[PDB]
């Protein structure tokens, strides 16, 4: 009713230790969401064209052309690691566990309170106003993860959070022929428009049922049950140079020290083994046959163009290129007492050794005369196309059937948790933004809107926008995310790497004297793992 609570606040993380080394992790997240009335109750089709920056020769990468439908609805996203875990629970997980499954997810909206502003300013209660809630359970509306724009709910249980205004990409065409500083022509910079065969205008009113929650109502999305693969919290270190049986050392060191090395007491052209170079007798560590290949090379900072413009080719694993950079604001980890619009940024350097070092590759003629001359080698220091800053490693692809690579690690707290699978015939082997991927169906999105509060002078035949009473809502959101983890076992004599607090990172976990908080990024895949 009007004076009865419809739910409870719960932000506890429960660890239930089943037998056989399996743990259930129930993460409860509760927030107070503050929502304003839409700027306009109409759907807009807006085109963004930053001609000012891309008309300059050399600024192709600064392209921001697109078309989007702007919607009067807002999205409530909780697809980020920081909504569910604090540094302590994250330490416990990444120090005690080895894998991680995604079991269940559920949401609720309760304790809705709608208010009206009257202009000093007076704030009255609208006991009869309503808040529209829509849940796209069938996954009809386009998927839109907020973690890529850093627009999820906040990371603090004691800080009120806002939802993000919903919008989606409308089709368009764009051609941007690249150039450089010193081009003699004006190649082409044209926004064509929309192909009528690809138009797609979605509305929440025509696709999903909308519930109207008043002050004493509550919404409860049932529990969604995932079915995915386990994310591993262990990293691998073995490259192709560390796979299999090492070579037998005929001369072992006698005086234990720092510069006393061992010696394989056999000439390189008199060794035994298998090679894939069928025209040479040398058996070394760079030439011996390994089972497969760990990682691959890919053209880095490469831009492929398509009907909607140029885009960067994504890299699976990096070692610079491949490492994701996260930028975020005061709601998502930045010091809440800083001033300015400069976001906090960090590059996540993963622990896994599955990248490449292009300054150390080379190609040589099949003759293999080992002391190699100039005309029989291609180094990462020779010009390709006459360009001093482009070598062959920039246009090199070594992805083949013998390539083995790992999935991306969780990024606390700004990384995404789950992702939807592409609705194509041939699916990608992994995503670079989320460790988990909903293959068949994924949790539905939760849109919120505040119902139109009309005045007494309303004319639908008036070209001007409707006059509404200034209304805003504050409700409470609750979420339950259930994981399954395995507890790790020690197989080595030596300890392993663990996450801990120390004198350097001490004040990143406690607030300042003025209430300033921050959530620094933590590594996830700490312990090593045997590959072969």
């Amino acid at each position: 009713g009007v004076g009865i609570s419809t739910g409870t606040f719960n932000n506890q993380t429960e660890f239930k230790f089943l037998e056989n080394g399996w743990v259930e992790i129930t993460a409860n997240s509760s927030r107070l969401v503050h929502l304003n009335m839409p700027e306009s109750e109409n759907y807009r089709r807006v085109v963004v064209n930053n001609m000012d920056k891309t008309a300059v020769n050399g600024n192709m990468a600064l392209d921001d052309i697109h078309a989007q439908i702007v919607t009067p609805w807002s999205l409530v996203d909780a697809n980020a690691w920081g909504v569910w875990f604090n540094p302590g629970d994250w330490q416990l997980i990444v120090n005690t566990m080895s894998e991680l499954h995604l079991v269940s997810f559920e949401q609720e909206i309760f304790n809705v309170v709608l208010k009206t502003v009257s202009e000093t300013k007076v704030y009255n209660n609208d006991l009869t106003a309503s808040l529209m809630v829509a849940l796209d359970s069938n996954n009809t509306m386009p998927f839109t993860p907020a973690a890529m724009r850093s627009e999820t709910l906040g990371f603090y249980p004691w800080k009120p959070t806002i939802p993000t205004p919903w919008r989606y990409y409308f089709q368009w065409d764009r051609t941007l022929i690249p150039s450089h500083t010193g081009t003699s022509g004006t190649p082409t910079n044209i926004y064509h428009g929309t192909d009528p065969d690809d138009v797609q205008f979605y509305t929440i009113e025509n696709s999903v049922p909308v519930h109207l929650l008043r002050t004493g109502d509550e919404f409860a999305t049932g529990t969604f049950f995932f079915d995915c693969k386990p994310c591993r919290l262990t990293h691998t270190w073995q490259t192709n140079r560390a796979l299999g049986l090492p070579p037998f050392l005929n001369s072992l060191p006698q005086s234990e020290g720092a510069t006393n090395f061992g010696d394989i007491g056999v000439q390189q052209d008199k060794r035994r083994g298998v090679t894939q170079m069928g025209n040479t007798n040398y058996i070394t560590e760079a030439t011996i046959m390994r089972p497969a290949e760990v990682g691959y090379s890919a053209p880095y900072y490469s831009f492929e163009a398509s009907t909607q413009g140029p885009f960067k080719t994504p890299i699976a694993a990096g070692r610079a290129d491949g490492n994701p950079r996260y930028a975020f604001g005061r709601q998502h980890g930045q010091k809440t007492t800083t001033t300015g619009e400069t976001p906090e940024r960090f590059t996540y350097i993963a622990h896994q050794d599955t990248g490449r070092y292009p300054e150390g590759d080379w190609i040589q003629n099949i003759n293999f005369n080992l002391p190699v001359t100039n005309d029989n080698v291609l180094l990462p220091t020779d010009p390709i196309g006459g360009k001093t800053g482009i070598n062959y490693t920039n246009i090199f692809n070594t992805y083949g059937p013998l390539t083995a690579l790992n999935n991306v690690p969780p990024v606390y707290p700004n990384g995404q948790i789950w992702d939807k699978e592409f609705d194509t015939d041939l699916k990608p082997r992994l995503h670079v933004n989320a460790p988990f991927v909903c293959q068949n169906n994924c949790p539905g999105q939760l849109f919120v809107k505040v119902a139109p509060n009309l005045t007494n002078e309303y004319d639908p035949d008036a070209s001007a926008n409707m006059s509404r009473i200034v209304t805003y809502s504050d409700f409470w959101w609750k979420g339950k995310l259930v994981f399954k983890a395995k507890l790790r076992a020690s197989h080595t004599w030596n300890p392993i790497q663990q996450m801990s607090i120390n004198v350097d990172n001490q004040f990143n976990y406690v607030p300042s004297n003025i209430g300033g908080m921050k959530i620094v990024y933590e590594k996830s895949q700490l312990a090593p793992r045997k590959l072969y």
């Epitope: 000012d52 920056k53 008309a55 300059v56 020769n57 150039s179 500083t181 010193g182 003699s184 004006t186």
Partner: antibody
Framework: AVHLQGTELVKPGASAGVKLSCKAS????????MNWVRQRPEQGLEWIGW???????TRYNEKFKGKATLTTDKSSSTAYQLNRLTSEDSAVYFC?????????????WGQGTLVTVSG | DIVMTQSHKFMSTSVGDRVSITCKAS??????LAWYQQIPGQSPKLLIY???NRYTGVPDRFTASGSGTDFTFTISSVQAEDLALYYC?????????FGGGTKLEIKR
């Protein structure tokens, strides 16, 4: 019909700053960055920086970093330079705009505003 | 920073001759070069961009060529309205740097 109109002479003392202005007419102001150049009678022309009025994005050179700050004003189509310390920086300042091509050539220049620092 | 040096500061010239101003760059700029003309006491006027292309409205007597570190800007037939201060700008990388200038004269 692109026209850039700068303010006229100024004579500040050797302690303060002066704000030079440049009014643009004849084009979408937010479609082109505004560049500021300097001409001393002995050291030649020199580029101070540029300001993109949409998004208000600046870039200077290392010489005029703490010496000049650029600012834009839409709804009036004006560009401003601040000239912080102005010790003996007496020269003619120009407000320039790219052109139609795409290279950072300067097709349209202002008439120039002279700044003399004395006592 | 790229320093751009024009060979001479004053170049003798008689009306009707062919004059060739030279410009050198500290490092290799591919084409990346613009040529300006300034009458003493006015604003510069853009003559050439990309070291070969002629801006709209420039008379066909001004041409330019070159690449890398050497560039040349030539007038095939001088007029009295062409004796000015010619500047050499590079638009290869920031900061944009100009040359010192070469004033064209009339022979004494």
């Amino acid at each position: 019909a692109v026209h850039l109109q700068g303010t006229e002479l100024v004579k500040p003392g050797a302690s303060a700053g002066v704000k030079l202005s440049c009014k643009a007419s004849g084009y979408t102001f937010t479609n082109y960055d505004m560049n500021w150049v300097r001409q001393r009678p002995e050291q030649g022309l020199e580029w101070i920086g540029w300001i993109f009025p949409g998004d208000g994005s600046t870039r200077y050179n290392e010489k005029f970093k703490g010496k000049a700050t650029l600012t834009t004003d839409k709804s009036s189509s004006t560009a401003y330079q601040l000239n912080r310390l102005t010790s003996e920086d007496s020269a003619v300042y120009f407000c320039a705009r790219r052109g139609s091509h795409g290279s950072y050539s300067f097709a349209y220049w202002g008439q120039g505003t002279l700044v003399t620092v004395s006592g | 920073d790229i320093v751009m040096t024009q060979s001479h500061k004053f170049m003798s010239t008689s009306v009707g001759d062919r004059v060739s101003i030279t410009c050198k760059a500290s490092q290799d700029v591919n084409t990346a070069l613009a040529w300006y003309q300034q009458i003493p006491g006015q604003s510069p006027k853009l003559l050439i961009y990309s070291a070969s292309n002629r801006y709209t409205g420039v008379p066909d007597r001004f041409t330019a060529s070159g690449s890398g570190t050497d560039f040349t800007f030539t007038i095939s037939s001088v007029q009295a309205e062409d004796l000015a201060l010619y500047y050499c700008q590079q638009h290869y990388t920031t900061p944009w740097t100009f040359g010192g200038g070469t004033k064209l004269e009339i022979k004494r």
